[PDB]
Swiss-Prot record:
It catalyses: a 1,2-diacyl-sn-glycero-3-phospho-(1D-myo-inositol) = 1D-myo-inositol 1,2-cyclic phosphate + a 1,2-diacyl-sn-glycerol. It comes from Staphylococcus aureus (strain Newman). The lineage of its organism: Bacteria, Bacillati, Bacillota, Bacilli, Bacillales. The gene is plc. Residues 16-165 form the PI-PLC X-box domain. PROSITE patterns: PIPLC_X_DOMAIN. Its main location: secreted. This is 1-phosphatidylinositol phosphodiesterase. Its EC number is 4.6.1.13. One of its GO terms (molecular function) is phosphoric diester hydrolase activity.
Length: 302
């Protein structure tokens, strides 16, 4: 039966000789915003309703963590200026928990600075992360620490792989884990080499697109992956967009239309390569419509 019928451990059912890049992974955009309760603020800043554990249980393996240095030793999880009511340790503890219960899954954790540090901070966001999280004895053995620029599932399962969106780092393990980091173009479909030129990263992140243009842009990169069997190529495809302060298309409205449209498209493509697709309201179902998380998972040929 479909891998999507057991999302708690779908990576356990793959050949762990595969590079993560070759694996079709569902991700959650601004994963940590499930904590938002304010109705007005939630229209444009709430991107998820399931907590980290439930997201994982629903089969999400790519986590989009954007944050802000709150103290010289603390990173708070943020959607821009909006604080999401927890620090990075919360997500790390939930991941460590889940990975222990499901030891043949891997988690790719993206890390980005979304907002200006607290006036008391004397450190860079990167330095705080490297020193107080990555190299923290508390999170010993949690992170992938190997030196493969293109790690395999075997090499990473049970661990969190860093997807570096912090700029240059002195961390030496994970995606964009060098002094160059990842050159990220603003509101664009783009292509850049990462990990000392080892990998070719292809990103659709047009987060300001109006609906029709967004679907076109997701589908464009979706099509390219389909006929791309190169393991040194990695695809990250965001289905999410910014809502804005006022209007009729609450992130939930947008998601309720694009998610099924892409899910339906993936399903028709059969077991073809999709890349890593990052969505709002991962695991959220609308009766009568295909589930994007489920179809991303099922698209993997075993």
């Amino acid at each position: 039966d479909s891998l999507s019928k057991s999302p708690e451990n779908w990576m356990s059912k793959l050949d762990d000789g595969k590079h993560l890049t070759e694996i079709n992974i569902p991700g959650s955009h601004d994963s940590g915003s499930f904590t938002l309760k304010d109705p007005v603020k939630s229209v444009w800043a709430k991107t998820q309703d399931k907590d980290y554990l439930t997201q994982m249980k629903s089969g999400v393996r790519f986590f989009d963590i954007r944050g802000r240095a709150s103290a010289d030793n603390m990173i708070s999880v943020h959607h821009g200026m909006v604080y999401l009511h927890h620090e990075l340790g919360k997500f790390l503890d939930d991941a460590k928990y889940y990975l222990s219960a499901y030891p043949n899954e891997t988690i790719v954790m993206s890390m980005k600075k979304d907002y200006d540090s607290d006036s008391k901070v004397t450190k860079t966001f990167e330095e705080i992360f490297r020193e107080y999280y990555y190299n923290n004895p508390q999170y010993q053995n949690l992170f992938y620490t190997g030196s493969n620029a293109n790690p395999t599932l075997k090499e990473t399962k049970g661990k969190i792989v860093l997807f570096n969106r912090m700029g240059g780092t002195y961390i030496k393990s994970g995606y964009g884990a060098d002094t160059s980091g990842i050159q990220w173009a603003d509101n664009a479909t783009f292509e850049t080499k990462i990990n000392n030129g080892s990998l070719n990263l292809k990103v659709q992140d047009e987060y300001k697109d109006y609906y029709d243009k967004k679907v076109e842009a997701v589908k464009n990169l979706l099509a390219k992956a389909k006929t791309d069997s190169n393991k040194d190529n990695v695809y990250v495809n965001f289905l999410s967009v910014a809502s804005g302060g006022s209007a009729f298309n609450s992130t939930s409205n947008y998601a309720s239309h694009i998610n099924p449209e892409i899910a339906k498209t993936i399903k028709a493509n059969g077991k073809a390569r999709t890349g890593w697709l990052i969505v709002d309201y991962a695991g959220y179902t609308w009766p009568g419509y295909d589930d994007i998380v489920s179809e991303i998972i099922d698209s993997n040929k075993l």
